Amino acid sequence: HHHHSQLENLYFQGSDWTSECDVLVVGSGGGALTGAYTAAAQGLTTIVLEKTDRFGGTSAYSGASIWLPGTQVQERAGLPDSTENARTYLRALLGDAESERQDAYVETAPAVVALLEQNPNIEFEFRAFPDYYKAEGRMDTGRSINPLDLDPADIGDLAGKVRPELDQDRTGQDHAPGPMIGGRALIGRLLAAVQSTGKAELRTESVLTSLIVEDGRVVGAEVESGGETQRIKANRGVLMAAGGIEGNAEMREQAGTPGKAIWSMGPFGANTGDAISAGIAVGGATALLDQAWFCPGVEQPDGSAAFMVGVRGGLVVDSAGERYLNESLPYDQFGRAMDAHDDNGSAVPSFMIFDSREGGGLPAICIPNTAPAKHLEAGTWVGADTLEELAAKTGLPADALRSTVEKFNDAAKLGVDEEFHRGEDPYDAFFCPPNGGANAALTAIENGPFYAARIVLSDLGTKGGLVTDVNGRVLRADGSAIDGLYAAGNTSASLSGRFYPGPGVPLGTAMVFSYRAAQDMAK
Numbered sequence: 315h316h317h318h319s320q321l322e323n324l325y326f327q328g329s330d331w332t333s334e335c336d337v338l339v340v341g342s343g344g345g346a347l348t349g350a351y352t353a354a355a356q357g358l359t360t361i362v363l364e365k366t367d368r369f370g371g372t373s374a375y376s377g378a379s380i381w382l383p384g385t386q387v388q389e390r391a392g393l394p395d396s397t398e399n400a401r402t403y404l405r406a407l408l409g410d411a412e413s414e415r416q417d418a419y420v421e422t423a424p425a426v427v428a429l430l431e432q433n434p435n436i437e438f439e440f441r442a443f444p445d446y447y448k449a450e451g452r453m454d455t456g457r458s459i460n461p462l463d464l465d466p467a468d469i470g471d472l473a474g475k476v477r478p479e480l481d482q483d484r485t486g487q488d489h490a491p492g493p494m495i496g497g498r499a500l501i502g503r504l505l506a507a508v509q510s511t512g513k514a515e516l517r518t519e520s521v522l523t524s525l526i527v528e529d530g531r532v533v534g535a536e537v538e539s540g541g542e543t544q545r546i547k548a549n550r551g552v553l554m555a556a557g558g559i560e561g562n563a564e565m566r567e568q569a570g571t572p573g574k575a576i577w578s579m580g581p582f583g584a585n586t587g588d589a590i591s592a593g594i595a596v597g598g599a600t601a602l603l604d605q606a607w608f609c610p611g612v613e614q615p616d617g618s619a620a621f622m623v624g625v626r627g628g629l630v631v632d633s634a635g636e637r638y639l640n641e642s643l644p645y646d647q648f649g650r651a652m653d654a655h656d657d658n659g660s661a662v663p664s665f666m667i668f669d670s671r672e673g674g675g676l677p678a679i680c681i682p683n684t685a686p687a688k689h690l691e692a693g694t695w696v697g698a699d700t701l702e703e704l705a706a707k708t709g710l711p712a713d714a715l716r717s718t719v720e721k722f723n724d725a726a727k728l729g730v731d732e733e734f735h736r737g738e739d740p741y742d743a744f745f746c747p748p749n750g751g752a753n754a755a756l757t758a759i760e761n762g763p764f765y766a767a768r769i770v771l772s773d774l775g776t777k778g779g780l781v782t783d784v785n786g787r788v789l790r791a792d793g794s795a796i797d798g799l800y801a802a803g804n805t806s807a808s809l810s811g812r813f814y815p816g817p818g819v820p821l822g823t824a825m826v827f828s829y830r831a832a833q834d835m836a837k
């Protein structure tokens with residue numbers, strides 16, 4: 315499947331429009347469905363194309379934490395925060411680079427939240443999760459909001475169409491027993507809201523392949539559904555919110571993107587840069603293709619990874635058996651530090667070192683969560699009764715590994731880490747239950763057996779793609795808009811550059827620029 319552009323005139327020699335809509339949405343992530351809702355709610359006929367047999371993509375896997383600050387939702391919680399406070403935080407991290415999109419992000423958040431909560435299927439609440447950088451306007455508790463838990467019965471036939479959590483989806487399973495939470499709830503509610511409008515068609519196994527141009531304007535796109543090709547006309551526009559290049563090893567190697575397709579937490583085979591490709595084919599510029607939403611990943615027997623988040627013990631060594639980062643860093647800064655320290659394989663993989671404090675468990679949240687016994691049969695993890703035997707089994711220098719652990723244990727006994735300042739930040743302390751020691755993030759590694767887990771450079775999607783303006787319009791290298799073409803989420807180059815400012819920025823940006831694209835199409 316290549317994403318070459320089809321000219322209207324050339325197609326007129328043979329075929330014709332299968333269907334017509336005002337707004338064609340490609341993808342069914344948080345952005346896609348927010349854009350679809352915005353379009354359909356104000357009377358525009360809308361078609362949503364999902365490539366796979368399940369709506370939601372990585373947005374479904376998410377915890378549905380959303381960085382939409384200064385809204386009616388944080389007002390109800392009485393949060394000491396504002397549009398201007400969130401605007402300062404972004405300015406302090408990102409600078410003047412993309413300041414117009416920074417302004418539009420923070421200024422439009424309130425309207426996106428107000429439009430969505432109006433729908434009986436949608437309600438959010440503030441949930442504490444710290445912002446990720448020391449800077450003016452940081453919220454030590456967070457300012458991010460989450461959809462309310464959703465009883466799958468309230469949405470009928472849509473619950474079985476929603477992609478399940480990673481602990482189910484990569485083991486051939488559907489939703490696990492309780493309610494829909496995190497991204498399952500975000501996608502269930504957005505699907506039900508889009509459907510409530512009576513102006514939207516929701517399609518599974520409908521793949522975008524090529525955009526249709528007349529006289530340089532996008533007028534529609536051919537979508538493959540069940541062996542047959544269809545030609546869908548879009549009177550107002552095509553919103554492309556179909557994710558990034560995360561699943562395409564060839565586009566990543568070409569762009570110089572660190573990590574690997576097989577380490578991405580995107581749904582296997584889903585996000586293969588189809589929409590970025592179709593956008594370049596009609597003259598769209600690209601930026602930041604070497605950038606991803608990075609995270610450490612626990613290497614799996616099958617060669618894939620698990621998102622390692624909320625670290626609360628252990629330490630991490632490079633291939634010399636030495637600490638080189640604060641292991642408690644927010645996952646994107648952790649991942650960037652693995653890549654920066656990588657000297658042809660000294661940091662990728664890294665080795666997470668831990669003891670039996672958690673009964674053999676690795677001291678973090680791993681998504682998905684493979685059983686220790688499985689990692690040990692497979693050799694992704696190794697165990698031993700001594701650090702000397704552990705260094706032997708991993709090929710780590712034994713004397714260095716022993717010094718590293720003895721020095722980390724002295725730091726745990728003292729309650730400060732001289733070397734990397736672990737535990738001296740509200741993000742670091744957030745995940746840690748009280749221990750009987752001075753710093754909750756620093757626990758002496760001394761209760762046998764001892765484990766070494768392989769850590770790789772995973773991602774939560776790439777963040778490079780098509781250049782967009784404040785209204786989600788796709789731009790050519792010259793700054794001019796391609797008429798009828800919008801992109802959002804990881805189809806579009808993030809305003810965040812080399813930064814992951816706080817929880818919910820991927821979904822928050824996606825939802826705001828999808829809303830703004832719909833509004834621009836309404837005219």
Ligand SMILES: Cc1cc2nc3c(=O)[nH]c(=O)nc-3n(C[C@H](O)[C@H](O)[C@H](O)COP(=O)(O)OP(=O)(O)OC[C@H]3O[C@@H](n4cnc5c(N)ncnc54)[C@H](O)[C@@H]3O)c2cc1C
Pocket residue numbers: 340341342343344345346363364365366368369370371372373374375376377378379380381480520521522523555556557558579580584585586588589607621681774775802803804805817818819820821822824
């Ligand atoms: C465990 C986990 C937790 C996370 N938690 C959060 C969080 O709380 N908040 C947050 O902001 N971010 C979070 N993230 C990151 C976030 O999920 C993603 O970066 C973000 O959702 C990307 O959304 P998207 O719209 O770019 O892509 P997706 O949500 O993946 O949507 C893309 C969709 O487009 C479809 N598609 C692809 N190609 C085509 C095509 N050719 N035609 C039609 N459809 C196509 C795909 O199948 C997919 O369904 C988390 C990630 C993970 C893995």
Ligand SMILES: C[C@]12C=CC(=O)C=C1CC[C@@H]1[C@@H]2CC[C@]2(C)C(=O)CC[C@@H]12
Pocket residue numbers: 376377378379443496623679816817818819820
């Ligand atoms: C770190 C995270 C991810 C990316 C992002 O952007 C925002 C968040 C905050 C919410 C957590 C989520 C990851 C998954 C978590 C840990 C859960 O399973 C419950 C709360 C979720």
